[PDB]
A paper describes a structure:
In particular, identical hydrophobic residues in the parallelly aligned [name] helices appeared to constitute the backbone of the bundle by engaging in pairwise ladder-like interactions (top). [name] helices did not directly interact with each other, but rather interacted with both [name] helices in an antiparallel fashion (middle and bottom). Since [name] P1 and [name] M4d form an elongated four-helix bundle that may serve as a building block for the self-assembly, the mode of interaction between the bundles may likely determine the directionality of the assembly that positions [name] at the outskirts of the [name] arrangement.
Here, we demonstrate that two of the human PCM scaffolds, [name] and Cep15212–14, cooperate to generate a higher-order cylindrical self-assembly capable of recruiting their downstream components, such as Plk4, a key regulator of centriole duplication. Here we showed that two centrosomal scaffolds, [name] and [name], cooperatively interact with each other to generate a heterotetrameric α-helical bundle, which in turn self-assembles into a higher-order cylindrical architecture that resembles the localization morphology of endogenous [name] detected around a centriole.
Numbering used by the authors:
A (entry chain C): 499 to 541, 1205 to 1249
B (entry chain A): 499 to 541, 1202 to 1248
Write the structure that this text describes.
Amino acid sequence: AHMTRFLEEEELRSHHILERLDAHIEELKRESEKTVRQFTALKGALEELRGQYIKAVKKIKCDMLRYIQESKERAAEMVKAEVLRERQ
Amino acid sequence: AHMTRFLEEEELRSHHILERLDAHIEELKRESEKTVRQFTALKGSEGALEELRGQYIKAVKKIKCDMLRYIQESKERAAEMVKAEVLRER
């Protein structure tokens, strides 16, 4: 029954990582409506907008790297626990 | 016996998704230079600024869609390991 706990954990880990991507998408969507409103109420905005997407994408790249790195450690931990189970 | 091959595979998948990630970041930067270039000309400037904004949001939705597929596959992998752990009780 080791692996069922592994899958339960993946299911949680999956729910969290997707939550923190929605957070990032929405922040982009909010900041960018504001900035498009500034420019429309006027007659520099290209840098705020592009600035924002770079922000959202950077944060997505960080969070995906932390997930990936956690995943590798988890796998290595299981490699370890398998070898411990070989004890006579 | 089994779990080192799981790790290896995890390493491989992890590098393939990060190639994918930088791949369509860089692609989606090409797509924006075209429409940014239009908006710079017009000083319809705003309808064109919304379109750009709609491309950034859409681009970051495609990144999410690839990231969901990756996650989904991890769940499928772990599921396959529940199965094979069950088969080894045989």
